[PDB]
Every structure is written in structure tokens, then in C-alpha cells.
RNA sequence: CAGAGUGUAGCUUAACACAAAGCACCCAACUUACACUUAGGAGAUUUCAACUUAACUUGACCGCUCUGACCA
């Protein structure tokens, strides 16, 4: 029943959500962020931490991206977050690493679509 | 009538003389990353954060938690670099990484996560729910000692409570199981 | 129809005549050829083409 | 005037005549490129020729077969002898002949006598009024003993500088020191005569350039001399 | 608003772009790469195109020249009639650069000739006088040019 | 170095097989090129007209 | 366009695929050093060239302006690639004829 | 040769600690080529100590630069 920040039809990305799955992949490390619409970050999962780095041969491969999603999906259930939006670019959507990250979140119990707001 | 600006112009630093010999973005992603950085910077003009961003006091929120543990960075880094080389030494790990068949154990990662950066993530997660805002009126504390609380449902199942997970009152009808790592002779106080 | 022209510059001063040209090309020539810059349909004075584009085209057809 | 003498040096270099041999890692990659190329290419006119003949011969007017034609080409190649990539001068270590080290670039060195002592340096000539600094470097070729060579000068700016001072013996207010400017050029064609070779000049690479040059002089030359 | 101190914050066209060779720089250079192997000619032009960008040198255009087919005829054994032996195809690649300093020309020329593979010919000629730079123009490009005259 | 960009392959989707062959010039020099047939060496003859 | 020129695609063994895969990763590092050496080579030439010009300007300002000017005689510049074998001093090529198709 | 100065892979006033980061660079695919993107690769604290967190502070050691000496 909480209102979503609708609008921003002429800019990307949109704002009509409560939580947004934002993935930041750098030259060496890959970081996935789950943040609220207000800008506050809910939970984070990145390859920079020693917890995941010690189990990854490479932090910049497809395996690292899939591994971040599996770890993040477990943390999303712990945090109580079950629904979030994913807003990738057309080339990022076609990328193989992002496809496995989406599968990891879905297999982790997280739905990549938020339910529509109830107005009445 | 023209009024001089109250501050530097957004694109004033760019030199228009040698415009042809300047590196361009050449991509959408490069501009987006630069666009996000400036959107998080204060400006002298009216901005979205001014009307919609959550106002915060200039005073830094005080800390009432335990002092941080003392860790030797040089010794800690030395072991990590050696472990990576040994992991990269094995050709099976590279083949699994190249064939995209490898995976990480979630339980082992969380156990190491719970001790290294678990308290810091929980503190940030607690702030989202406004626990520090309500319980301590904004005062924050790092949960240095992890707390394990789980409710006994039936005789074999357990419902752990990590941070804000959904728990029904039926599962919370009785006192849960409370465990934590502590030294002998110390005194503690539980609160719900 | 010849298919020998990679880039075309069709200019007529009257927009009404130009609008007829677009419909004729649309009805006959498939959109894929007209999709790119291969066919450029503009409505300007032909006297400008003697200065704006000098020595650009090898074959010029002038029906005044 | 100034107490520093202007000398126009010249850096004549011989471009490689033969390609540098491939490294062991390059050999594996080059063979890989050929193997990938075959697997992603269609049958040629000759490969289709072999298939047609084999099917026809299996059932049973082409006089020359595909396999027979390949044999003729192989025999002709064996009769032809390739030129020696490693020349006799490399075996003899004769650093005066351009035929040596065709794979690597060569640097010309001439031995001149200063202060009753022989020092190997690049050819150089003192600058003169009413002449460009580059033009003095071109004059160095004319001063060479019995040389018939054509050099291609690249640009007009000097490629380096070396500074030295007299060892308190010839040091004077009018003559305090000198500054040499290095001009690089490419040896298109020609070579020196057979009158004098060993004591006159040598041709050495960058790796073996330190044997003749001084430690201070070698440092300034290795900056504008590459070893690619 | 114009009277507001934040006037002009949305201006962007002054950050967007709307040949003569001086005595210090070379105006137009055409780097012709002739080789009988098509892969070698394409690869060297690709290396030069990457090299020019790394050195902050503008590349105007990268294109190819029409293939020239040359038949090789050899005298028959103990005869007088010419017989076909082989056919060689001549491939040429052109990389056009502009904005090269006179001082940097010596360094650039040495780098390319050192990296020139076997069987590939290097040919750089000053073709700025030839001009004939007839290129098809897009509508947004052409519209701005007409507005200047109007 | 001449090997800066010499080691390459055919960048075509459809093409016939090519072989590494030697091209003997009018001065005896040889270069490596690609020929349709597996002829290990080729020698360019001197033209009679250019005399 | 005929499909009769197509060749059968023989399956690649795991050892062959492993050999190719490990070869490409080592080839990427090999080419990185060649660029690094070439990058430093250009800088070494450029740094010495600029410093030499500075010394020439103080010694003679007029000669400094003459060197920095362009060289019209430099272009056009022609250069041929290396060969596989050195030219034979005593070689008589066979007779022949050339025909050009355009 | 001393004399001063200086020090994280190319760059950075990145490095509170949870961690040695970001960018640039390198290969391949795609492109005539570039660029974009995808898929991959290589990386650094000069070295030892100081009550310890110390890439950070103090010297020592060590690596470069700079002015004279030395110099053809």
C-alpha cells in the first residue's frame, strides 16, 4: 500500500520500486547492492570481502557473478527482503553473467518482480 | 537582467579550446558512472535530495558499542595472498572456473562473513529498520558478539532469527534457544 | 531499382511533392533499404547543393 | 659566441632484412591460428578435386590426379635452396659487414682519436654558421672514407644530446665544453669500400653497444635506439 | 531561468563539435599498405589504427583499395608459348591520419617501419593537395550548415 | 619488431583453405604469403618487356 | 554458395580444448609485455627528444626554431617489409610475362 | 663522488576498516578498422626494526631524481 516514486519517464533507470537490485562490476571486483528507493542500502555482497574472495579463483569471471547472487539471495531472505527489481541495460541483460545472477536470486527464493501497489 | 552564479558551473572546468583533442565517453555506461557520482555531491542549486532525501543532523551519531578488535593488517594480508596462490596453483579450479561449473559453499562463507564484516552489515541493516532511531534515538553500536536465536518448532525443526526475518507468533509461543560465544566469568543481559 | 546507388540524395523544393515521393518509395521499395542513410529525402533549394556538397557525388541527375 | 662547441652527430641504422624468428610461445599460437583456420574454412578447389577422383576411382578422364600434383610441387621445393638466415659474418663475428644479423637492427660506430686515445663514437661534425644543425649531420656522410650510401633522414629535430667537459687540461673560458646532437637516419642502400674495414668502422646492436661506448655516452644513446 | 544564478546549467551544444598543414605539423597523410596476403595487410592496418589512437593521433578514415589481379605467365620448357603458372592478388590497405607533429614524425615513422611484417609494403604520401573529400552528409549535419547561410 | 602483428588468421566466415608458401622475387629474396594450392615455393619470373 | 564445399567438423578432444584454452591465456600476457616495452620505447624516444630541444633553445634560439619546423622533403616515404631469406648475389630468374586484371 | 630531495602496478589527497580500491592498460569474439559490448588476462606498498594500528609515524636500509665533483 506504500506509494512508489512514479514518474521519471524520460530518464533511466526508473524509480517505481521499493527495493532495487543494483550490480556493480568493476575491472577486478563485482559488487551487488540491494538498496531501498530512498537511497539507503539494505544488504551487500561483493567479492572484495575475504569471506567470498577465499573461495573464488577469479573475482571477475562468470562464476564470481553467480557466486555473489547465491550469497546475496541467502542474505536477502535473512534480511526479510523477498521482492526486488532488476533494471539492467540491454547489453547487460544479454550478458551471460547477469543471467546466472538472476537465476541465483530466483533459486535463492527472491522474486525479481515487485507486486503492484494497492490503491483501493 | 543576469545574476552571477553562486558557485562553479557544472561544466566550467572543461576547456573549449582543444575540444577535438579531448577524450570522449564513447559509451553509455561510462557517462552513467560519472553521472551517478555527481548526483551524490552537494550543490548550491535546488536538488532532488533536498526535498526527498532523509534529513540528517550534522552531529555524527555516537557509538556505544564494544571497541574494535586489534588485527595486524600486514600478517593478515600475508596469509591471504599465499592462500590465493595455492588456490590458483591447482589446475582443477581454473578448469572449473573456465567451464563455469565451480561453486562456493554458502555455510562456510557465512561463518567467515559473520566474524569479519557481519557486525558491520547488520549495523547498516539495523539502521534501515530504524532500530537505532527508536531504541537509542539515533545512537549506533556495532554488534561485535553475534547472537544466535532460534525458536523450537515441534521437536526437530528450528526457526532462526537473523535480522528482520518473518516469524509467526505460533513459532514464538515459547522461549527460543539463545546461544553466543562468550568467555567464562563474564556477565550478560538479554533483552527482547 | 538498379541497385547501383549506395547513397541517394533526393531533394525537391516543394514539400507536397516530397510527401508524394516518400509514399511512393514506401509502397514500392522495402523499408530495409530506406532504413539507413542510403536514401536521403530532403526539401531544400537545389541551388544550395552547389555549395553545401561540392564534388560529393559521381552521378548527378538534374530534372529542373 | 659561447664556450660550448656544437657538433652535429649522425646515427645511421640498418633496418632488419629478415624477419625475427618466432618465440616458442609464438610457434604454438601461430600453429593454433592455422588449425583454427582449417576447421572454419570450406573445401578448396583442390580439396574438392581429391574427393571427386576418389569416388570415381572407387567406382572404377583426368590424367593428373590431386595427390600426384602435390608430389610435383614438393620435389621442386627441395631442388630450390633457401638463402642463409645466419650468414658467414655471424660465424666470423665480423662486425664491419652489413650481412651479419639481418634479423636485428645495426648501429654504425666509428673509432676516432681524442687526446692520444681512441674512442668509439657516432660519426659527428662541428656545426658551422650559415647551416642547419641537421645539415651538419648530413655532412658527416660526405666526410666518411670511401662511402657510397644513401640515407633517409627522418625529421629535423635532434634525437638526443650528450654533454661533456674537458678534464681541466683543455678547459678554457673560450672553450669550456661541447654539446653533440644525435640525428637518426635509415640506411637505404650501399656500403663502405674495401680499403679499410676493421679499424675504420663497426656495426653493432644495442645489446653489444656498451663494449665500445663509455658508460656516460652509452646511457644517452640507448634512449633513442630501440631493440624491437 | 535567465535571471536566476543557475541560468545556462542545461547548455550542452558548446561541448559538442559543430585541411591545412602548418609549418610545424603535417596536414594529411595516407599510409598505403601493399601486400599479397590479405590477412597481413588487414592486420597491420589494424595495429596502426590502434597505435595511432594510443599516441593521441586522429585517424580520419580506414578503408581499402580495389584488388589488382596479376597473372603470372612463365615460358614453357623448350618452347616459345607462355603458360599460366600462378595468379597473384594485390591487396592494399589505407590508414589516413591527421595532426602529426614534425618532431614526433621521426618517432612515429621508426615505430611503424620496425613493426612492419615481412611481405608488406609501407607507403606514406602527402595527399592533402588531392582533396576530393566527397562524403555523404546526414540530415542533422546538413541542416546546421544551411542555417549558417540563412 | 616485424612480429608485432604478423601472426594472424583469416578473419572471414566463408573462405577456402590457404597454405603458407614462399614467394621468390627477381632478386632471390623470399617472403611468406598464402596461396590456394599447397605449392611450397613460387618464383616470380623476370618480364621480357621491361628490358 | 554451394554447401558441397563444406567439410565435416571433427569433434575436439578434451585435451585439445584444454591445450588451446591454456595457450590463449598465456598469449594475452605475452602481448601485454610487448606493448609495455613499446610504450616505454616511445617514451624513451620522446623524453630524450624533448629534453634535447630544451638544451638547443638555450644554446641557440634560432637553431631551435629551425629544427621544430616541418620537413616537406621527408614525405613521401616508402619502405618495404623484410624478407625470409637474403637476396642471392648470383641468381638469374627465369623468363616470364605479367598480365594485370582489373 | 658526496650534497639535499624523493618512494603504493601507469595515474590518484584510494585505503575509517570489513579491505590493499577505482581508473587506464593486455588477449579473443563482433567491426574494413576504430569504438561499444560480451567473454578472459597481468598486476603494486624498497627492505628491516621501533610500546602497536603503522601503505601512513621516527630513523636505519633500499630504490630514483636533482646541483656540483668526475669528465674527451
Curated annotation (Swiss-Prot), chain B:
Residues 73-101 form a coiled coil. It comes from the Eukaryota. Keywords: Coiled coil, Mitochondrion, Ribonucleoprotein, Ribosomal protein, Transit peptide. The keyword DNA damage does not apply. It is found in: Mitochondrion. GO terms for cellular component: cytosol; mitochondrial inner membrane; mitochondrial large ribosomal subunit; mitochondrion. GO terms for biological process: mitochondrial translation. Transmembrane segments: none annotated. Component of the mitochondrial large ribosomal subunit (mt-LSU). Mature mammalian 55S mitochondrial ribosomes consist of a small (28S) and a large (39S) subunit. The 28S small subunit contains a 12S ribosomal RNA (12S mt-rRNA) and 30 different proteins. The 39S large subunit contains a 16S rRNA (16S mt-rRNA), a copy of mitochondrial valine transfer RNA (mt-tRNA(Val)), which plays an integral structural role, and 52 different proteins. mL38 is located at the central protuberance. Belongs to the phosphatidylethanolamine-binding protein family. Mitochondrion-specific ribosomal protein mL38 subfamily. This is Large ribosomal subunit protein mL38. It comes from Homo sapiens. The gene is MRPL38. The chain holds residues 27 to 218 of 380 of the full protein.
UniProtKB/Swiss-Prot annotation, chain D:
Its main location: mitochondrion. InterPro entries: NUDIX_hydrolase-like_dom_sf (IPR015797), Ribosomal_mL46 (IPR040008), Ribosomal_mL46_N (IPR021757), Ribosomal_mL46_NUDIX (IPR033650). GO terms for cellular component: cell junction; cytosol; mitochondrial inner membrane; mitochondrial large ribosomal subunit; mitochondrion; nucleoplasm. GO terms for molecular function: structural constituent of ribosome. The modification N6-acetyllysine is found at residue 179. GO terms for biological process: mitochondrial translation. It holds the Pfam family MRP-L46. Transmembrane segments: none annotated. Gene3D superfamilies: Nucleoside Triphosphate Pyrophosphohydrolase. It is found in: Mitochondrion. Component of the mitochondrial large ribosomal subunit (mt-LSU). Mature mammalian 55S mitochondrial ribosomes consist of a small (28S) and a large (39S) subunit. The 28S small subunit contains a 12S ribosomal RNA (12S mt-rRNA) and 30 different proteins. The 39S large subunit contains a 16S rRNA (16S mt-rRNA), a copy of mitochondrial valine transfer RNA (mt-tRNA(Val)), which plays an integral structural role, and 52 different proteins. mL46 is located at the central protuberance. Belongs to the mitochondrion-specific ribosomal protein mL46 family. This is Large ribosomal subunit protein mL46. It comes from Homo sapiens (Human).
From Swiss-Prot, chain E:
One of its GO terms (cellular component) is mitochondrial inner membrane. It is found in: Mitochondrion. It comes from the Eukaryota. One of its GO terms (biological process) is mitochondrial translation. Keywords: Mitochondrion, Ribonucleoprotein, Ribosomal protein, Transit peptide. The modification N6-succinyllysine is found at residue 137. Component of the mitochondrial large ribosomal subunit (mt-LSU). Mature mammalian 55S mitochondrial ribosomes consist of a small (28S) and a large (39S) subunit. The 28S small subunit contains a 12S ribosomal RNA (12S mt-rRNA) and 30 different proteins. The 39S large subunit contains a 16S rRNA (16S mt-rRNA), a copy of mitochondrial valine transfer RNA (mt-tRNA(Val)), which plays an integral structural role, and 52 different proteins. mL48 is located at the central protuberance. Interacts with OXA1L. Belongs to the mitochondrion-specific ribosomal protein mL48 family. This is Large ribosomal subunit protein mL48. The gene is MRPL48. The chain holds residues 48 to 212 of 212 of the full protein.
UniProtKB/Swiss-Prot annotation, chain G:
It is found in: Mitochondrion. It comes from the Eukaryota. Residues 74-98 are annotated as: Disordered. Ubiquitous. Component of the mitochondrial large ribosomal subunit (mt-LSU). Mature mammalian 55S mitochondrial ribosomes consist of a small (28S) and a large (39S) subunit. The 28S small subunit contains a 12S ribosomal RNA (12S mt-rRNA) and 30 different proteins. The 39S large subunit contains a 16S rRNA (16S mt-rRNA), a copy of mitochondrial valine transfer RNA (mt-tRNA(Val)), which plays an integral structural role, and 52 different proteins. mL40 binds to the major groove of the anticodon stem of mt-tRNA(Val) in the central protuberance. Belongs to the mitochondrion-specific ribosomal protein mL40 family. This is Large ribosomal subunit protein mL40. It comes from Homo sapiens (Human). The gene is MRPL40. The chain holds residues 95 to 196 of 206 of the full protein.
Amino acid at each position: 500500500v506504500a506509494r512508489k516514486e512514479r514518474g521519471w519517464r524520460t530518464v533511466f533507470p526508473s524509480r517505481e520500486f521499493w527495493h532495487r537490485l543494483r550490480v556493480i562490476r568493476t575491472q577486478h571486483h563485482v559488487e551487488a547492492l540491494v538498496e531501498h528507493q530512498n537511497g539507503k542500502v539494505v544488504v551487500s555482497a561483493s567479492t572484495r570481502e575475504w569471506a567470498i574472495k577465499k573461495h573464488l579463483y577469479s573475482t571477475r569471471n562468470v562464476v564470481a557473478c553467480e557466486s555473489i547472487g547465491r550469497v546475496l539471495a541467502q542474505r536477502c531472505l535473512e534480511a526479510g527482503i523477498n521482492f526486488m527489481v532488476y533494471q539492467p541495460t540491454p547489453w547487460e541483460a544479454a550478458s551471460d553473467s547477469m543471467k546466472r545472477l538472476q537465476s541465483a536470486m530466483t533459486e535463492g527464493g527472491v522474486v525479481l518482480r515487485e507486486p503492484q501497489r494497492i490503491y483501493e | 537582467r543576469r545574476t552571477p552564479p553562486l558557485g562553479p558551473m557544472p561544466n566550467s572546468d572543461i576547456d573549449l579550446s582543444n575540444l577535438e583533442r579531448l577524450e570522449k565517453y564513447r559509451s553509455f555506461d561510462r557517462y552513467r558512472r560519472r553521472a551517478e557520482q555527481e548526483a551524490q555531491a552537494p550543490h548550491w542549486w535546488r536538488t532532488y535530495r533536498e526535498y526527498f532525501g532523509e534529513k540528517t543532523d550534522p552531529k555524527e551519531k555516537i557509538d556505544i558499542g564494544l571497541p574494535p578488535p586489534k588485527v595486524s593488517r600486514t600478517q593478515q594480508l600475508l596469509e591471504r595472498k599465499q592462500a590465493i596462490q595455492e588456490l590458483r596453483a591447482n589446475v582443477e579450479e581454473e578448469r572449473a572456473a573456465r567451464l563455469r561449473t565451480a561453486s562456493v559453499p554458502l555455510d562456510a562463507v557465512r561463518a567467515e562473513w559473520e566474524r569479519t564484516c557481519g557486525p558491520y552489515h547488520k549495523q547498516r541493516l539495523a539502521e534501515y529498520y530504524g532500530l537505532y532511531r527508536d531504541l537509542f534515538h539515533g545512537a549506533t553500536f556495532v554488534p561485535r558478539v553475534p547472537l544466535h536465536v532460534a525458536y523450537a518448532v515441534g521437536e526437530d525443526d528450528l526457526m532462526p532469527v537473523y535480522c528482520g526475518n518473518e516469524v509467526t507468533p505460533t513459532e514464538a509461543a515459547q522461549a527460543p534457544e539463545v546461544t553466543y560465544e562468550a568467555e567464562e566469568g563474564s556477565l550478560w543481559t538479554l533483552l527482547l | 531499382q538498379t541497385g547501383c546507388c549506395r547513397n541517394l540524395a533526393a531533394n525537391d523544393l516543394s514539400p507536397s511533392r516530397i510527401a508524394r515521393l516518400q509514399k511512393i518509395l514506401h509502397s514500392y521499395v522495402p523499408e530495409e533499404i530506406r532504413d539507413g542513410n542510403q536514401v536521403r529525402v530532403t526539401s531544400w533549394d537545389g541551388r544550395k547543393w552547389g555549395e553545401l556538397e561540392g564534388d560529393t557525388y559521381d552521378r548527378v541527375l538534374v530534372d529542373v | 659566441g659561447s664556450p660550448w662547441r656544437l657538433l652535429g652527430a649522425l646515427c645511421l641504422q640498418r633496418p632488419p632484412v629478415v624477419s625475427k624468428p618466432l618465440t616458442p610461445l609464438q610457434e604454438e599460437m601461430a600453429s593454433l591460428l592455422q588449425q583454427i583456420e582449417i576447421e572454419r574454412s570450406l573445401y578448396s578447389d583442390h580439396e574438392l578435386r581429391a574427393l571427386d577422383e576418389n569416388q570415381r576411382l572407387a567406382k572404377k578422364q583426368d590424367i593428373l590426379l590431386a595427390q600426384d600434383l602435390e608430389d610435383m610441387w614438393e620435389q621442386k621445393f627441395l631442388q630450390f635452396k633457401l638463402g642463409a638466415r645466419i650468414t658467414e659474418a655471424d660465424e666470423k663475428n665480423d662486425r664491419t659487414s652489413l650481412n651479419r644479423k639481418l634479423d636485428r637492427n645495426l648501429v654504425l660506430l666509428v673509432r676516432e682519436k681524442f687526446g692520444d686515445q681512441d674512442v668509439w663514437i657516432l660519426p659527428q661534425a662541428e656545426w658551422q654558421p650559415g647551416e642547419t644543425l641537421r645539415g651538419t649531420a648530413e655532412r658527416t656522410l660526405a666526410t666518411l672514407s670511401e662511402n657510397n650510401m644513401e640515407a633517409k633522414f627522418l625529421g629535423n629535430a635532434p634525437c638526443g644530446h650528450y654533454t661533456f667537459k674537458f678534464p681541466q687540461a683543455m678547459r678554457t673560458e673560450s672553450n669550456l665544453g661541447a654539446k653533440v646532437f644525435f640525428f637518426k637516419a635509415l640506411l637505404l642502400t650501399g656500403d663502405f669500400s674495401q680499403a679499410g674495414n676493421k679499424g675504420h668502422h663497426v656495426w653493432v646492436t644495442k645489446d653489444e653497444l656498451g663494449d665500445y661506448l663509455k658508460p656516460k655516452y652509452l646511457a644517452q644513446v640507448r634512449r633513442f635506439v630501440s631493440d624491437l | 531561468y535567465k535571471t536566476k544564478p543557475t541560468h545556462g546549467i542545461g547548455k550542452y551544444k558548446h561541448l559538442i563539435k559543430a585541411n591545412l598543414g602548418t609549418d610545424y605539423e603535417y596536414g594529411v597523410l595516407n599510409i598505403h599498405l601493399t601486400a599479397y596476403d590479405m590477412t597481413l595487410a588487414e592486420s597491420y592496418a589494424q595495429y596502426v589504427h590502434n597505435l595511432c589512437n594510443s599516441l593521441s593521433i586522429k585517424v580520419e578514415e580506414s578503408y581499402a583499395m580495389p584488388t589488382k589481379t596479376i597473372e603470372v605467365l612463365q615460358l614453357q620448357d623448350q618452347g616459345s608459348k607462355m603458360l599460366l603458372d600462378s595468379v597473384l592478388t594485390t591487396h592494399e590497405r589505407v590508414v589516413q591520419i591527421s595532426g602529426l607533429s614534425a618532431t614526433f614524425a621521426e618517432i612515429f615513422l621508426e615505430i611503424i617501419q620496425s613493426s612492419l611484417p615481412e611481405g608488406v609494403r609501407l607507403s606514406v604520401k602527402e595527399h592533402t593537395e588531392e582533396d576530393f573529400k566527397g562524403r555523404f552528409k546526414a540530415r542533422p549535419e546538413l541542416e546546421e550548415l544551411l542555417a549558417k547561410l540563412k | 619488431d616485424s612480429s608485432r602483428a604478423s601472426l594472424t588468421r583469416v578473419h572471414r566466415q566463408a573462405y577456402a583453405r590457404l597454405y603458407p608458401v614462399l614467394l621468390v622475387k627477381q632478386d632471390g629474396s623470399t617472403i611468406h604469403i598464402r596461396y590456394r594450392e599447397p605449392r611450397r615455393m613460387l618464383a616470380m619470373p623476370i618480364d621480357l618487356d621491361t628490358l | 554458395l554451394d554447401k558441397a564445399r563444406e567439410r565435416p567438423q571433427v569433434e575436439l578432444t578434451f585435451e585439445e580444448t584444454e591445450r588451446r584454452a591454456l595457450l590463449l591465456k598465456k598469449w594475452s600476457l605475452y602481448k601485454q609485455q610487448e606493448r609495455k616495452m613499446e610504450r616505454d620505447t616511445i617514451r624513451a624516444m620522446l623524453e630524450a627528444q624533448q629534453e634535447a630541444l630544451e638544451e638547443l633553445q638555450l644554446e641557440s634560439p634560432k637553431l631551435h626554431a629551425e629544427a621544430i619546423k616541418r620537413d616537406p622533403n621527408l614525405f613521401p616515404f616508402e619502405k618495404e617489409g623484410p624478407h625470409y631469406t637474403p637476396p642471392i648475389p648470383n641468381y638469374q630468374p627465369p623468363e616470364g610475362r605479367y598480365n594485370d586484371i582489373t
